[PDB]
Write an enzyme that holds these catalytic residues in place. Structure first.
Site, mmCIF file in Angstrom:
data_model
loop_
_atom_site.group_PDB
_atom_site.id
_atom_site.type_symbol
_atom_site.label_atom_id
_atom_site.label_comp_id
_atom_site.label_asym_id
_atom_site.label_seq_id
_atom_site.Cartn_x
_atom_site.Cartn_y
_atom_site.Cartn_z
ATOM 1 N N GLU A 1 0.784 -1.144 -0.112
ATOM 2 C CA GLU A 1 -0.152 -0.008 -0.129
ATOM 3 C C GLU A 1 0.859 1.257 0.037
ATOM 4 O OE1 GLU A 1 -2.404 -0.405 3.645
ATOM 5 O OE2 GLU A 1 -3.310 -2.498 2.784
ATOM 6 N N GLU B 1 -6.755 3.791 -4.637
ATOM 7 C CA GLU B 1 -6.983 2.210 -4.358
ATOM 8 C C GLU B 1 -6.235 1.263 -4.876
ATOM 9 O OE1 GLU B 1 -10.581 3.153 -1.944
ATOM 10 O OE2 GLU B 1 -9.316 1.331 -2.263
ATOM 11 N N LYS C 1 -11.848 -6.996 -10.003
ATOM 12 C CA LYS C 1 -11.449 -6.201 -8.684
ATOM 13 C C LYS C 1 -11.189 -4.723 -9.332
ATOM 14 C CE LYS C 1 -10.083 -4.952 -4.856
ATOM 15 N NZ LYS C 1 -11.062 -4.646 -3.663
ATOM 16 N N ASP D 1 -6.597 3.777 0.011
ATOM 17 C CA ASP D 1 -5.092 3.560 0.398
ATOM 18 C C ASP D 1 -4.389 4.648 0.329
ATOM 19 O OD1 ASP D 1 -5.475 0.663 0.597
ATOM 20 O OD2 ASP D 1 -5.871 0.507 -1.465
#
Ligand SMILES: O=C(O)/C(O)=C/C(=O)C1(Cc2ccc(Cl)cc2)CCN(Cc2ccccc2)CC1
Ligand SMILES: [Cl-]
Ligand SMILES: [Cl-]
Ligand SMILES: [Mn+2]
Ligand SMILES: [Mn+2]
Ligand code: NA
Ligand code: NA
Lengths: 199, 189
Positions: free
Chosen positions: A57, A108, A121, A95
């Site tokens: 992240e 993200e 996704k 994120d």
């Protein structure tokens, strides 16, 4: 002294990797400490997975020119902390983020291992950010949404070999933990639990 | 969570009678911080209450220190080699008769019967061995359908169980996030 390579040594090796081969970036300090303090196999596993996730992240935030969302602030919180009110606003924890002038960059990121799940996704995360573009526009904010989809766990805070070995040991811990749980479910303690259903 | 563990500790300290046979397991319970261990030691604490009531009702000594059958005999000067490792909920040697007691709690008839037969078989498997050594086994299996006991008020017994159940609930809800979350993908990867 003598290495027998059972679950206690698996845990000790994961700790050595964490201490000596994950870069000393300050944004990782809290999760490293959280990980190092775990004693139960299943919990070592879980915080280990979270540590790995956090490396990815933050890596994504840096590469995307965003601030990593260290404390899991909501978009509303991020706005409210800069004197901007958007009150009708679904719960979204990005994120990464960066408010520049009137533009709010939101990031993200994810990892998927097959093309089908990668694409699925990517769509989900895209729609997630899109559904608040209008509200932000009302409050005078331009949404700049970024979805960073990845195909592996590579990141700048761990060498490739260490990343692989860390995942390899996590997998072995998972196998041990699953066996430990199976054995537990055959114990009297589990039966006493079942009976606790009295409530 | 802290509040839950704190409530459990106050029950343990203030609403479980101070029979000294319970003291060790109370201390074991009170030193647990970790949810999974609180639950296990809490269930052991309730089990000890039931076992002691059962022993007191069966004219037996409660096996507070987890002695083996082999150990119990030695302490009375009887040598019986080869005995499998068995730790009874209770015991008493009178004359040449060794009373051995197994206690349990089960909350359905199906599980009750299955456990009753299991503990019965458990003790039966050393009858011959004991008889060789000149000892007549008197094996007692005492099955309970709930956790009722003489050391706790019914309301406190219920609150204690309710709190333990909430702990168990939280843990199942946690494992359902490791189940549905990004960290799950990674683990199944
Ligand atoms: O099912 C039951 O009612 C029961 O009384 C179980 C037990 O006593 C064992 C588990 C246990 C259950 C309750 C309590 Cl308070 C403490 C321990 C498992 C069988 N035993 C396992 C064992 C065998 C040989 C050597 C050590 C342990 C002893 C601990
Ligand atoms: Cl920046
Ligand atoms: Cl490799
Ligand atoms: Mn027992
Ligand atoms: Mn028992
Ligand atoms: Na930057
Ligand atoms: Na490699």
């Amino acid at each position: 002294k003598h290495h027998h390579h059972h679950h206690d040594e698996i845990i000790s090796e994961l700790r050595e990797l964490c201490l000596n081969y994950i870069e000393q970036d300050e944004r990782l300090s809290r999760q490293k400490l959280n990980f190092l303090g775990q004693r139960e196999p299943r919990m070592v596993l879980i915080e280990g997975l979270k540590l790995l996730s956090r490396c990815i992240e933050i890596d994504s935030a840096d590469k995307s020119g965003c601030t990593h969302n260290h404390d899991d602030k909501s978009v509303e919180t991020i706005l409210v902390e800069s004197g901007i009110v958007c009150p009708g606003l679904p719960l979204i924890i990005p994120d990464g983020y960066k408010l520049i002038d009137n533009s709010l960059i939101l990031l993200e990121c994810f990892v998927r291992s097959t093309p089908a799940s990668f694409e699925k996704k990517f769509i989900e995360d895209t729609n997630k950010l899109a559904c608040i573009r209008e509200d932000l526009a009302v409050a005078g904010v331009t949404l700049v949404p970024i979805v960073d989809g990845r195909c592996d766990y590579d990141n700048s805070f761990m060498p490739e070999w260490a990343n692989f070995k860390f995942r390899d040991l996590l997998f072995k811990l998972l196998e041990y933990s699953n066996q430990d749980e199976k054995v537990f479910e055959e114990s009297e303690y589990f039966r006493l639990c079942e009976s606790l259903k009295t409530t």
